[PDB]
């Protein structure tokens, strides 16, 4: 079916679903019940920004979130990853809200990915960032409450005119182009993703996260993926 | 209709169309009747570059292309571009056969975008370049004669098993993803591109050129642009 | 002697120098009297920022200086600049003040140039962006009023503890390292610089100006480059 | 004293200083007895490549040789890398001979390194490429039998005219500009070094092997670091 791997941003602790007590950040491999986590003191209002890394020579899956002058967090996971996603898989981001509400905002994409090794010495790339999200993208894959023309931002929630989010939705935006992280030849793949975050939110309870993902190509917003799930994983924890 | 702004490479002088006495590389616009050109000594079964630069400032199309030792050719076209073509476009490359024969190969291909201003100082881009063109890139857009997986190459005309190029083929290939050179803000817009060729030919009057260009999204080849017309050109010159 | 050419910030019009009525921007060659101008609202207070490009190719010196919601200014000089310039330079930047005073800080420092062609298809660069200048660059070549690690950001003009710039200073920065815009094979050559800006000044006569040029290797500050010359300009218009 | 941290390319065994019974590539921590090492079958006038990849997050050191068609070799160690070197270093490559000879050539040379963090979302950075290696670079740290323009590539190790290299010398070639792998907001940096390799060789015992290392800025050739010792290694193993 549906696959994905991706890195989550839990500002709600949901202990049901072997969540713990605290909003987290924690990788999750198929599953929502992270493999790793790292408390997460979130900060309301201000503008963050998360970084992952991996390469196909290490085989490890880290990634950091951070604010000015404040302390950041850090987790890894050891995976192979080829094993897990496909040669050709698709990079995308999301969050969802279903009992409580919270902005979901990125206001920055910058993604890059390489490709070594067949001795060849050429390698294969592709870079970009983003910071200016106009409406109508077409490089961009948005679905759900995912919208895109507000001040230059890629909003993924939905939030009102006046500014009062809503906690029913779900947003995930993905490339319209693939990614290659395979190669006979390869010896060597290598991608690195960080965009920004705005997490407002009225209540002292915000929900319900965000994330970073790659899954298949004809992927699909999950059914009942609203809150904890994610909106990535298809229900069954 | 079909438009297209791109850069041929004519090792077939057809005086004809308004076409010179010599193998030459000229800018079309909208027209295959180059707005400009320069003399080119191809050089047959050599390996060559051809580098593409353009500045929403300055508003010049340049390209220059060479193989070693050698020396090389220059010519360069003023044109605004934002009259020409649209915000969102298309990237690609191609070439024609149909008199005569020749291959027309490309073994990488490199690319770089990049969109600023907005004051903001953000900066929008994608970049990326291959040298092993394996079969079923995905993220390639392969129309006609155009082949993947032969020896990391890429080769857009029709050849044979042990090496019999055919005359009557034309390939088109063009980037899965979008590009954008536009942008509301938009005070600077930039991209470079350079590809490699290895030009054979047995003929000692090979045949028919190789390009680059831009089109529409829904760009289909043209349907009697083979040979000069280029396969970008739709016909009347 | 020592030589420069540069792009000048020139927020004090010096007729008397053959300066314009107004603050603008201008391409100095060996001369402070620009070869070309654009008339430039300044904006007390505000962030900017300012882009240069030049291509071996095209042989045109264009930049442009912007800040959000507002309308930016175009100036382009033509100049093949291998006359002008030694094969190997460096970079840097600066600012003066004298009968007035102002601050004449860059936040940012974004650095890359690329050089081609030796149709080997291999080239040859390097690039670099700064934004937290700490104290105690290294890498960094700071001469005169020249500061670094206050906000991590890097002023160049003298200024109070409190905050009240001195007017009689002159700040220049260059890279350690050294530049290559030559090469034998050289076909193609490349080079992208763009910098924040923050300039406040209390008086409504802010000076004097900031800007950005290449020079001697064992290049220094002129002796009474204070003001309009620019710390660039031997004296002598 | 003087300190490094390299990845060595041992095509001779020297088991006296704990040097296995085979060429192979080793990463040497203030000593040249690697703390780990991986089988590497060297190959006669091939043309090769090395990879090298280590984040402030991992925490660990890999690097990656290999040549077309041929199957590559994988080594890594753990090493927060914090405490072994300063904030400040420099980059550079070597190999040294005595009592065999060989050639020791690197015909390119790319260089990238990141640093992040500062929840400012800014990152400094610095890349660069080479692979014609002029007279005279300037850019370029040349130390000992290293010398610069044959064919556009860096031979480090001393060869005659025709082509007989010699067994006594010893190459180091090092960035005339230094590097920063620190910062106080310092939650991720990021560096990745691959050069190109050409190794010949009349006997069949080739010797004695290339590297790539970090050091102090006033690093200086080791007195006796001829042959194995690596000329990195100051002596005492
Ligand atoms: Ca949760
Ligand atoms: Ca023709
Ligand atoms: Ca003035
Ligand atoms: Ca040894
Ligand atoms: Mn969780
Ligand atoms: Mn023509
Ligand atoms: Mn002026
Ligand atoms: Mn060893």
Redesign the pocket.
């Known amino acids: 079916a549906d696959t994905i791997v991706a890195v ?1 941003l ?5 202990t049901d ?1 072997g ?2 007590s605290y ?2 950040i924690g990788i999750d491999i198929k599953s ?1 019940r992270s493999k790793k986590t790292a408390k997460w003191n979130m900060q309301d209002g201000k503008v963050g920004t998360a970084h992952i890394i991996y390469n196909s020579v290490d085989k490890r899956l880290s990634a950091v979130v951070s604010y000015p002058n404040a302390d950041a967090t850090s987790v890894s996971y050891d995976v192979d990853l080829n094993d897990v996603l496909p040669e050709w898989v698709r990079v995308g981001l999301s969050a969802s809200t279903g009992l409580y509400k919270e902005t979901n905002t990125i206001l920055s994409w910058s993604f890059t990915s390489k490709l070594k090794s067949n001795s060849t010495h050429q390698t294969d790339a592709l870079h970009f960032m983003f910071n200016q999200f106009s409406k109508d993208q077409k490089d961009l894959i948005l679905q759900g409450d995912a919208t895109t023309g507000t001040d230059g931002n890629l909003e993924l929630t939905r939030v009102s005119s006046n500014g009062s989010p809503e906690g029913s939705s779900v947003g995930r935006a993905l490339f319209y182009a693939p990614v290659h992280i395979w190669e006979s030849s390869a010896a060597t793949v290598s991608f690195e993703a960080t965009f920004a975050f705005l997490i407002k939110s009225p209540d002292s309870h915000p ?3 965000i994330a970073f993902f790659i899954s298949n190509i004809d992927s699909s917003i999950p059914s009942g993926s609203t ?2 799930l ?1 909106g990535l994983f298809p229900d069954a924890n």
């Open positions: 989550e839990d500002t709600y602790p949901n679903i969540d713990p909003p987290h929502v929900a319900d996260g809150g904890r994610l």
